[PDB]
């Protein structure tokens, strides 16, 4: 069908001020025309923004739609029926909050992607990693510590819906795993390149994978025209990953000046996920997060904010991401705020649009309202270019969310 | 049995003209004499061509004898007996069109090779690959896309007759797989070096195999005094294959001037198979050819004709091939027509003779009628060196087909 | 409830082995021990009652309708497990013979019964068993 | 399509003299009408017998289509393709010799039955058993004797074409075995109830399977509305199989009067196969039959003809059967003339027709030319009721062979 927006301020992410007196025409889930001159509307439904803001749909580069509880190893043991059903409300809340596209960083596979694309369920467009690859005892290894090693999972053949990752060791093993995830429909590859917080037995500073394993993994992803994202916190872990060809680094809280520069020199992106740490600290214990993981939050939580300053100083391209678990999923939009404490509103908005879209290899198709781009559009009760505050919460000040050229929400008419 | 051909025009690939007034002496499946001055054989069965054409047996360098349907995965699950039986006509129809030798590119094994050699059935002399090697998720991986990986074969110990490939990943697996096919009697080795038009999930631009895996495979073939042929469309896929040592490149639809020179320089051969992209476009869908497979075709259809030009200009040795599936196996001869749209009839006929023969390392033993070669001879009602229309069809204008110094078809007498 | 196609080989019933598919309506089990174990797993996993195929089916790859499903020993073993947990067995069955053996082995409800004769119907009624006919599905199928 | 038979002598197997003055109308593969009064059919293709004999197609209840040579354990190991292609001429020769139906008693499965039905190949209709069931070290266990026990078959999941049997031990295992053969499409179930001859390790008088296994096997066959046939030689072995519910007894060479009566009393059948032992005693040793199986030949050969008297004296219903291997399959018809040494021609003919049909559960549908029965008709230049000598050989005196209302051979003109 067709649509026409007018009488509203146009937020173009690479212009520091709203474009005024513009009109947008949507046809068949694509932006058709954008001009400072009124448009010829024969068969288009008209929307009067009445001087409110039209912006591109938002992008979250780091989400886990199947992270339905704080205890991740436990989620993998939950019935597939349940994990699936509890992800529905989740995906839907994401869309309400303005997120028309998301990258899943581990868990959700192709099936979710097609469930959404087909209309079965509603949510952001999904870019799916499949299961994150981790070495034995790595961040994505759900096994507790004892005197024996149970096998990674019950039947290595059938994927558990609740599984966020999978264990693979050695070049052959990791090359096969990547080949399977891709076979199965993954858009990109996730790996753990260091220890983590929400895992049972791995320290935060510990490396993930030999270089051999990382270069093997990277070469597969690329061979299929894709790329690798890597969970890593410390300079050494980040640095080896980047040298090994990883395209985006997840978190990177303990990055330093030397590492930040390497990153920028190599063209890699970093996706900070600051809200999650606040949240793991606020309500982690309270919501059944293992006391092993809680111990590991502090080592990484403090550095969060300054890592951004470091990154901006070096000119590192930062994308937007959140990484929230369980009930904490509701806090997605807070990341905007947290960031505005160091970056200018324009800066954070660019990270959650054009920069993120670059990460996705979707430049000019997402993150900006222009001829040919997907018709993911928002109407906001405010000017994000001045204050990110209107994006906060559960979409209150976002009266209209449109994805693929269809209205999911529209309390304007 | 001993024959002598007389009173006809001799086709010699390395001469632009049908030579005249020549006598040919076949003793024991071998050509004993070809000369202008008549020769006496009191004993021999004399055959008067009637001024018609005596050319060498035709050679097709890319067939799939067991491609009995367009749906290849489904074929692999059919009973070995049916596949075996349904393959007989196919192999017969190939000889009738004058192909006295064919290189099977995956599926047919030494068993067929020896069924033909012994006389159990009539068809071309076979150069077999056994199963094509493919990485997980690659062209020759028949598994569908879901949220689990079933085993490559119900039971890897026993080859399914209708299986065109086998999955192998990583150096030690590719090494073992190659050593296994060779011991089972393969003449050469096939690998999928890219995404396919007739596979279940992979795109076409995708790579197949790391260079480590390709090089290991090549050294294994080489170690047994043979070679690797590789499926590959794009210039990057093609170049890496070549630099890794593969000796013939299958299809190569999207090759460019850059890569062509590289091929030529390393002395690799290329076996286009333009015919099959018509068949698939024309009647593939209708004939139970999977829908997701169908979308692939547009990808390589147009380039086909132009690639021959690029390759010729580069001085790339091109062999003959058709790569047809199911009911389309009957279009085998059209490749002649197609190639003459862009190539000299002489050039074409040489592609399917002295060139193909050099690919099989059978120079002076096949594809040319000369003292000390196989008695692979045809009689054509026409002059291919002037036109190619006589080879078309089911052999209507090919009334004498002789392989191994014996007559499979005769309509002169 | 055996989904496998007909060919010259038997691939496995379970690709998973451990993991149940959400889309699986059934599972293959043969032999008293095998069937005991399967009923015990289904129960521990939370089943309210136990279903068996006691006959061939309309909607299936290979099985004709008139064939029996399971020996009497297998059915009896299944019925005993169901009862040890205070529940019962239901059985898909069409023909008098198939229906009758089932009831004699302790099966509590019969599903379909489309081809039941007047004799076995009394057998059913006497043994206090129930029948669930499912007429509508045959309309829709046709 | 329609035919009309006329001026021929009708052989009806339930009447001692050749009925004269009859006309047979076939249309669409079925016997439409038979009567004295000429038949009024406008387009029937009229066929002129010219006083030759018209009989029902012959039936053999014990063939092995895939017994392409005397070394049966070795056959199991030959490639599927090769076994398959060598069974072809064998099935074809059988149809020349007038056998329009055959019960294959172990080896050939559903695939072969459908290749025939789809006219993929030419040969007798097939009632198949799939693989015969044999206890460990039973007569269908091809494993040589050593100090260790290799797997029954290289690979449990897939079936080998050249495999005539399969090892199964224990009630549960034998119940699963049968259910498998039945799901793959077997028509009936074969078991080895005794030691054998053409096998490595087992003596003749040894029991095969326990009663528990035999009964569960029989109950499995009956549950699907079919039956069991058992290899069995001695009175003890034979007696237990019949008591456990077995319906046909194969061979029965060493049966005594007490057991012959038991068989009759149960209404079961015996299928002698006298011709095979002459063959083994003649050209087994010469055609690559292992010396181990030659030692056992003398154990059943000499009792052959007397067993027919015993059986006849006792009222036993005897089907026709040959059970030949490899080169000796050619001798198939010789069974007629061996049986006729003890039985009247009439009694033999009935064996190969009406009694066989009774075994197949095909009464009035096969073995008799009557309205409704399948159009399986022979033209015999002779009177089998006087001498079966005209049936001997390769159909030399059978100039017409018709199966399912279609002519496979016709030299009448
Ligand atoms: Zn992470
Ligand atoms: Zn994460
Ligand atoms: Zn190919
Ligand atoms: Zn091919
Ligand atoms: Zn049912
Ligand atoms: Zn036998
Ligand atoms: Zn036998």
Residue D399 host element (H or E): none
C-alpha B60, offset from chain centre: 4
Contact list in D for residue B120 (CB cut-off 8 A) is: 82, 85-86
Residues 6+ apart with CB under 8 A from D173: none
Which two tokens mark A127? 């870019």
Question: What's the length of chain D?
Answer: 413
Chains touching chain C through at least 3 C-beta pairs below 8 angstroms are A, B, D
Q: Coil, strand, or helix at residue D294?
A: helix
Which two tokens mark D288? 């690559």
Same domain flag for B410 and B336: no
Give ion ligand 7 contacts, CB < 5 A: D 105, 323
Q: DSSP label at D5?
A: E
User: How far apart are the CA of B154 and the nearest CA of chain C, in angstroms?
Assistant: 6
Same domain flag for A138 and A91: yes
Q: DSSP label at A159?
A: P
Contact B336, B348 (CB under 8 A): yes
User: How far apart are the CA of C51 and the nearest CA of chain D, in angstroms?
Assistant: 20
Place of tokens 């490149």: B249
Q: DSSP label at B281?
A: I
Residue of D nearest to B107 (CA): D81
Contact A28, A70 (CB under 8 A): no
CATH number for the domain that contains residue B84: 3.20.20.140
Domains identified in chain D, total number:
2
Put simply, the answer to whether A171 touches B170 (Cβ < 8 Å) is yes
CATH number for the domain that contains residue A410: 2.30.40.10
C-alpha A281, offset from chain centre: 21
How far is D87 from C118, CA to CA, in rounded Å?
51
Quickly list H helices, A39-185.
72-75, 80-96, 110-118, 171-183
- Give counts: helices (H), strands (E), chain D: 13, 18
Contact B318, B270 (CB under 8 A): yes
Place of tokens 């590119």: B105
Strand pairing class (A23-27; A30-35): antiparallel
Same domain flag for B411 and B307: no
Contact D321, D64 (CB under 8 A): no
From residue D138, alpha-carbon distances to A51, A257, D322 in Å are 91, 78, 22
Same domain flag for B5 and B73: no
Q: How far is the CA of C109 from the centre of ligand 7 (A)?
A: 45
Q: Coil, strand, or helix at residue B3?
A: strand
Contact list in B for residue A111 (CB cut-off 8 A) is: 147
User: What domain range is D234 assigned to?
Assistant: 58-363
Same domain flag for B165 and B311: yes
DSSP B25-60: EEETTEEEEEESS----SSSEEEE--S-EEEEPEEE
How far is B360 from B343, CA to CA, in rounded Å?
23
Residues 6+ apart with CB under 8 A from C1: C25, C26, C27, C28, C53, C57, C60
Put simply, the answer to whether B77 touches C15 (Cβ < 8 Å) is no
Closest CA to D141 of D183, D174, D169: D169
Put simply, the answer to whether B79 touches C8 (Cβ < 8 Å) is yes
What method did the depositors use to determine the structure?
Answer: X-ray
How far is D181 from D226, CA to CA, in rounded Å?
12
Quickly list H helices, B71-207.
72-76, 80-96, 110-118, 171-184
How far is D271 from D260, CA to CA, in rounded Å?
12
Put simply, the answer to whether C15 touches A81 (Cβ < 8 Å) is no
DSSP B143-168: ---SSB---SSS-TTS--TT--EEE-
How far is A21 from A7, CA to CA, in rounded Å?
7
Buried b (16+ CB within 10 A) or exposed e, B41-76: beebeebebeebbbbbbbbbbbbbbbbbbbbbbebb
How far is B204 from B236, CA to CA, in rounded Å?
12
Residue of C nearest to D216 (CA): C71
Q: Give the number of other Cβ atoms within 10 Å of residue D293's Cβ.
A: 20
Same domain flag for D64 and D173: yes
Burial class (CB in 10 A: 0-12, 13-18, 19+), D329: buried
Contact B17, B53 (CB under 8 A): no
Closest CA to A56 of A304, A411, A353, A398: A353
Same domain flag for D118 and D139: yes
Residue D23 host element (H or E): strand D19-27
Same domain flag for A14 and A123: no
Which two tokens mark A178? 């990547």
Which two tokens mark B49? 């061509």
Contact C4, C11 (CB under 8 A): yes
Q: DSSP label at A326?
A: G
How far is B270 from B310, CA to CA, in rounded Å?
12
Quickly list H helices, B144-274.
171-184, 211-223, 235-243, 257-266
Q: Which of A363, A382, A401 is the last residue of a domain?
A: A363
How far is A155 from A175, CA to CA, in rounded Å?
20
Same domain flag for A265 and A314: yes
Put simply, the answer to whether C2 touches D183 (Cβ < 8 Å) is yes
Q: DSSP label at B79?
A: -
Residue B78 host element (H or E): none
Closest CA to B140 of B116, B171, B174, B117: B174
Q: Coil, strand, or helix at residue B372?
A: coil
Place of tokens 């192909």: B99
Put simply, the answer to whether A223 touches B206 (Cβ < 8 Å) is yes
Residues 6+ apart with CB under 8 A from A265: none
C-alpha C4, offset from chain centre: 17
Contact list in C for residue A157 (CB cut-off 8 A) is: 15-17, 19
User: How far apart are the CA of C125 and the nearest CA of chain A, in angstroms?
Assistant: 39
How far is D11 from D23, CA to CA, in rounded Å?
12
Same domain flag for B88 and B190: yes
Put simply, the answer to whether B135 touches A219 (Cβ < 8 Å) is no
Q: Coil, strand, or helix at residue A24?
A: strand
Quickly list H helices, A119-208.
171-183
Name the CA radius of gyration of chain C, rounded. Answer: 15
From residue C22, alpha-carbon distances to A81, A160, B12, C19, C26 in Å are 7, 11, 66, 9, 10
How far is D217 from D230, CA to CA, in rounded Å?
11
Contact A12, A368 (CB under 8 A): yes
Put simply, the answer to whether B155 touches D156 (Cβ < 8 Å) is yes
C-alpha A118, offset from chain centre: 21
Residue D53 host element (H or E): strand D53-56
Phi, psi of D232 (to 5 degrees): -165, 135
Quickly list H helices, C26-117.
32-44, 72-84, 96-104
Name the CA radius of gyration of chain A, rounded. Answer: 21
How far is A128 from A104, CA to CA, in rounded Å?
5
How far is B32 from D55, CA to CA, in rounded Å?
55
Chains touching chain B through at least 3 C-beta pairs below 8 angstroms are A, C, D
User: How far apart are the CA of A129 and the nearest CA of chain B, in angstroms?
Assistant: 13
Put simply, the answer to whether B77 touches C16 (Cβ < 8 Å) is no
Same domain flag for A191 and A42: no
How far is A112 from D342, CA to CA, in rounded Å?
77
Residue B310: HSE in the Cβ half-sphere, 13 Å Cα cutoff: 20
Closest CA to D334 of D343, D321, D346: D321
Question: What's the length of chain C?
Answer: 142
Which two tokens mark B386? 């002037």
Whole-angstrom distance between the N-terminal and C-terminal Cα of chain B?
Answer: 17
DSSP D58-114: EEEEEE-TT--SS-HHHHHHS-HHHHHHHHHHHHHHHHHTTEEEEEE-SS--HHHHH
| Most A-contacting residue of B136, B143, B167, B240 (CB-CB within 10 A), to test interface | B136
Contact C54, C107 (CB under 8 A): yes
How far is A368 from A356, CA to CA, in rounded Å?
11
Residue of A nearest to C20 (CA): A158
Q: Kindly compute the dihedral angle of the four CA atoms of residues D230, D233, D237, D240, in this order, to the nearest 10 degrees.
A: 50
Same domain flag for B105 and B28: no
C-alpha B18, offset from chain centre: 26
Phi, psi of B399 (to 5 degrees): -90, -10
Q: Where are the beta strands (DSSP E) in B325-396?
A: 377-380
Q: Coil, strand, or helix at residue A256?
A: coil
Residues 6+ apart with CB under 8 A from A117: A125
Strand pairing class (D406-410; D400-403): antiparallel
Burial class (CB in 10 A: 0-12, 13-18, 19+), C36: middle
Place of tokens 């005596």: B54
DSSP A20-51: -S-EEEEETTEEEEEESS----SS-EEEE-SS
Closest CA to A245 of A213, A285, A218, A278: A218
D53 has which bridge partners?
D9, D380
How far is D204 from D292, CA to CA, in rounded Å?
12
From residue D386, alpha-carbon distances to D308, D345, D390 in Å are 20, 6, 10
- Give counts: helices (H), strands (E), chain B: 13, 18
Residue A6 host element (H or E): strand A2-6
From residue D25, alpha-carbon distances to B3, B186, D411 in Å are 51, 55, 20
Q: How far is the CA of A261 from the centre of ligand 1 (A)?
A: 21
Place of tokens 């069955």: C93
From residue A90, alpha-carbon distances to A108, A118, A281, A302, A334 in Å are 12, 18, 21, 28, 16
Q: How far is the CA of B237 from the centre of ligand 3 (A)?
A: 13
Buried b (16+ CB within 10 A) or exposed e, B266-280: eebbbbbbbbbbbbb
How far is B366 from A254, CA to CA, in rounded Å?
69
Closest CA to A58 of A348, A274, A367: A367
Cα angle at A14 between A9 and A20, to 5 degrees? 20
Which two tokens mark A45? 């439904």
| Most B-contacting residue of D68, D69, D79 (CB-CB within 10 A), to test interface | D79
Put simply, the answer to whether A157 touches C21 (Cβ < 8 Å) is no
Place of tokens 């209404």: D267
Q: How far is the CA of C69 from the centre of ligand 7 (A)?
A: 30
Which two tokens mark D359? 């075994």
Q: How far is the CA of D144 from the centre of ligand 6 (A)?
A: 19
D25 has which bridge partners?
D4, D33
Which two tokens mark B316? 């790339």
Q: Coil, strand, or helix at residue C93?
A: strand
Q: DSSP label at A346?
A: H
Put simply, the answer to whether B137 touches A179 (Cβ < 8 Å) is yes
From residue A235, alpha-carbon distances to A143, A243, A310, D119 in Å are 27, 12, 12, 72
Burial class (CB in 10 A: 0-12, 13-18, 19+), A384: buried
Q: Give the number of other Cβ atoms within 10 Å of residue B411's Cβ.
A: 12
The conformational region for residue B47 under phi > 0 = left, psi -120 to 50 = alpha, else beta, is beta
Which two tokens mark B30? 């071998």
DSSP A206-237: -B-S-HHHHHHHHHHHHHTT--EEEEE-SHHH
Contact D276, D323 (CB under 8 A): yes
How far is C77 from C70, CA to CA, in rounded Å?
11
A54 has which bridge partners?
A10, A379
Phi, psi of C133 (to 5 degrees): -80, 150
Place of tokens 């096997």: D217
DSSP D183-247: HTT-SSEEEE-B--SSSSS--TT-B-S-HHHHHHHHHHHHHTT--EEEEE-SHHHHHHHHHTT--
Residue B294: HSE in the Cβ half-sphere, 13 Å Cα cutoff: 11
Which two tokens mark A18? 């709203």
> Going edge to edge, which strands form the sheet with B189-192?
B165-167, B132-134, B189-192, B228-232, B248-251, B269-271
Whole-angstrom distance between the N-terminal and C-terminal Cα of chain C?
Answer: 21
Closest CA to A276 of A264, A257, A293: A293
Which two tokens mark B309? 């030009």
Cross-chain CB nearest to C30 (options D159, D179, D219):
D179
Phi, psi of B379 (to 5 degrees): -130, 115
How far is B393 from D103, CA to CA, in rounded Å?
43
Do chain D and chain A touch with ≥3 beta carbon pairs under 8 Å? no
Question: What's the length of chain B?
Answer: 413
User: How far apart are the CA of C15 and the nearest CA of chain D, in angstroms?
Assistant: 13
Whole-angstrom distance between the N-terminal and C-terminal Cα of chain D?
Answer: 19
Do chain D and chain B touch with ≥3 beta carbon pairs under 8 Å? yes
């Amino acid at each position: 069908t067709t649509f026409l927006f007018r009488n509203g301020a146009l937020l173009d992410p690479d212009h520091p001020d709203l474009l005024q007196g513009f009109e947008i025409l949507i046809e068949d889930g694509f932006i058709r025309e954008v001009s400072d001159k009124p448009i010829k509307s024969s068969n288009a439904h008209v929307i009067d923004v009445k001087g409110k803001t039209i912006m591109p749909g938002l992008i979250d580069l780091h989400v886990h739609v199947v992270a339905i509880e704080f205890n991740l190893p436990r989620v993998a043991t939950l019935p597939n029926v349940l994990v699936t059903l509890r992800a529905v409300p989740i995906m839907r809340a994401m869309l309400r909050r303005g997120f028309t596209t998301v990258r899943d960083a581990g868990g959700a596979g192709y099936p979710f992607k097609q469930a959404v694309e087909s209309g079965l369920v509603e949510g952001p467009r999904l870019f799916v990693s499949g299961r994150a690859l981790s070495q034995t005892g790595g961040h994505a290894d759900p096994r507790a510590r004892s005197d024996y090693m149970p096998p990674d999972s019950p039947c290595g053949c059938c994927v558990r819906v609740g599984a966020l990752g999978r264990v693979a060791d050695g070049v052959d093993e990791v090359r096969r795993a990547v080949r399977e995830e891709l076979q199965m429909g993954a858009d990109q590859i996730k790996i753990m390149a260091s220890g983590g917080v929400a895992s049972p037995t791995d320290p935060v500073g510990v490396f993930g994978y030999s270089e051999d394993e990382i270069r093997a993994i990277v070469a597969e992803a690329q061979g299929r025209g894709t790329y690798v994202l890597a969970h890593a916190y410390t300079p050494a872990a980040i640095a080896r990953a980047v040298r090994c060809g990883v395209r985006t680094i997840e978190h990177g809280n303990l990055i330093d000046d030397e590492t930040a520069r390497l990153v920028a020199e190599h063209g890699a992106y970093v996706v900070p996920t600051l809200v999650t740490y606040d949240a793991l600290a606020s309500e982690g214990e309270k919501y059944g997060l293992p006391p092993e993981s809680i111990a590991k939050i502090a080592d990484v939580h403090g550095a969060g904010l300054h890592s951004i300053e470091i990154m901006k100083r070096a000119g590192v391209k930062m994308g937007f991401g959140t990484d929230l678990l369980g009930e904490a999923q509701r806090l997605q939009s807070d990341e905007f705020r947290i960031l505005a404490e160091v970056l200018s509103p324009a800066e954070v908005i660019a990270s959650a649009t054009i920069v993120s879209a670059e990460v996705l290899g979707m430049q000019d198709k997402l993150g900006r309202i222009v001829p040919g781009a997907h018709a993911d559009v928002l109407v906001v009760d405010g000017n994000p270019l001045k204050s990110v505050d209107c994006l906060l919460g559960q979409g209150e000040h976002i009266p209209l969310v449109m994805k693929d050229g269809r209205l999911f929400v529209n309390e304007l008419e």
